[PDB]
Symmetry: C3
């Protein structure tokens, strides 16, 4: 259902292997197991998330509907979606979501759960779950409001319209827009630049960043000063400070 | 005093208009009170799916900056002047259906604060916005200090309030104060065109994202994610999901 | 280590420069503690209406991220961060607005000082970054928090993780700097802007400052409680009527 390919050796690419369709509750639990093994793995430093093939990081907004169930099964299905999204967000290494095309619905939510999104020019993003009678279920209603603002979040969830990649850099949904034939190379170059950076400086920057967003400045500064301390008991600080 | 028209595909879209072009559609005490009743105090009727808010006359949305200098009484009562503005901005903000604020020209003081309470702001190319309250001696007391920084950030909000200037529409879209900017002649159609797109989608799935968004903006990720999972299950208890 | 000139129309704009031209205005424990005295620990004199912070030499605001003379005693940096968290707390919470006319290099400790200011007006040569991770540590004086609350989580993560160095053209593209103006016209542009706020009501602007600076850390309802309390006070103050 997937592949893992590490090379440097400190970076792997995780490729969602379902080109015939899309993220069900079967390729999501697989996504949980793959990102838990990278948490305990010490010889990868950043993670590149992309879709198999050349036309969709993930289109799970038109091509997978187990939605013929009762309301109670919706809670479990959403809980699976929150967990996989939470896993790929709070993973130890930085995540680069290489958007090679369609990233809609759940696919956008998984991509939004990543740290950095570099999209191909031939990429389409949005939250069309309102066309099927539901809100976003895997994390659209909150994460989308945090990366692009409350204004552009309401426009993209109420209408449910699909948008091109260029207007996503304009609204900040993606960080960089790069050609489809140059998406893998540019994502790797960014990955190599982060990989060359200190692991403990970056990984503990992520913890202070992924947690300082959920509190005031004062409490967030407490995590930073605790982040400041931990990287100091590490030879990485002293060795590179020359 | 104010005008409402309910007309769309089987009457789903309502266009609410402030009626005071004589004084640039200013917002005094009565205009706040009358508008709050129009939004029915945080609910509406089932017929309306999308709300469109825009000042009548095509000249201004609400230029209540220079034309209402009535703040000359009893700083005790200034609490109830801000409370009334706080209530009107909450009622527009927390109304059941999405609000499309099609600004047409001037939006200053409380008028800019009224627009920021809405969900989506589509701008005319002749529109200008700002919070000139500081030039008088007061901050924006209708949510202008709080709402403004949550839509454009801390750098642009602080710059806008401190100087108290007026920004043209293209720089409002640049910082995100307005979602879209369209020619004034073609404004009401484009504002309408987005409304039928929102109304065409399932109504309950629209107003449940709104609850999860308007309430998830005021909490950490964990609490906000727990609100989404409740509206998501709420939307599976209704035929719109299956059909 | 400092230079404090105060002259304007109504004589209320105080120009504050970092005085260390030979070291690119680097940030050590000696210049950090003075800027706290320069800002008198969350107050000022009643004459000053507006504060402008820039760097001496017109070539570096503060290149204090790339002063790496602290490689010892993980305990003796808790305070180094506490020192760096105290200038930011004093510069950000000073009574009158802070306008950072950054002039050239402003990185990390210099950059996080700029993030403490309300307004940043850069120049073509003004270029910013947070290369702390390339050193082996996260930002310590508020970089992991103030950058996110300005440019959003997506671009802060890109800046903090890579620790790379961006121009002013894209610094205004992401909201890191409010305005960009030629290298011959920073101080004049900073002055005219600083005049524009100085000509407004003194109680109106600083009580907005308290309403926004404390309101960005609470929910909307509590933030409105901040504004209503400050709003009533201005009515008691004579500037509201005349």
């Amino acid at each position: 259902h997937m592949s893992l390919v590490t090379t440097s050796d400190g970076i792997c690419t995780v490729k969602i292997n379902r080109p015939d369709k899309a993220m069900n509750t079967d390729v999501a639990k697989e996504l949980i197991k793959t990102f838990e093994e990278l948490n305990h793995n010490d010889d990868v430093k950043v993670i590149i998330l992309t879709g198999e093939g050349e036309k969709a990081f993930s289109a799970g907004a038109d091509i997978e509907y187990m939605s013929k169930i009762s309301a109670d099964e919706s809670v479990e299905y959403a809980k699976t979606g929150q967990l996989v999204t939470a896993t790929v967000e709070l993973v130890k290494q930085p995540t680069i979501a290489a958007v090679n095309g369609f990233a809609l619905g759940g696919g956008c939510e998984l991509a939004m759960s990543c740290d950095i999104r570099i999209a191909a020019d031939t990429a389409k993003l949005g939250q069309p779950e309102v066309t099927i009678g539901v809100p976003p279920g895997w994390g659209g209603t909150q994460r989308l409001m945090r990366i692009v603002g409350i204004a552009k979040a309401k426009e993209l969830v109420y209408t449910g319209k699909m948008i091109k990649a260029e207007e996503a850099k304009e609204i900040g949904l993606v960080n960089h827009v790069v050609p489809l034939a140059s998406l893998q190379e540019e994502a790797l170059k960014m990955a190599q630049q982060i990989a060359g950076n200190s692991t403990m400086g970056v990984q503990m920057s992520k913890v202070a960043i992924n947690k300082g967003r959920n509190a005031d400045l004062d409490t967030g500064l407490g995590l930073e000063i605790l982040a400041w301390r931990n990287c100091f008991t590490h030879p990485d600080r002293q060795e590179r400070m020359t």
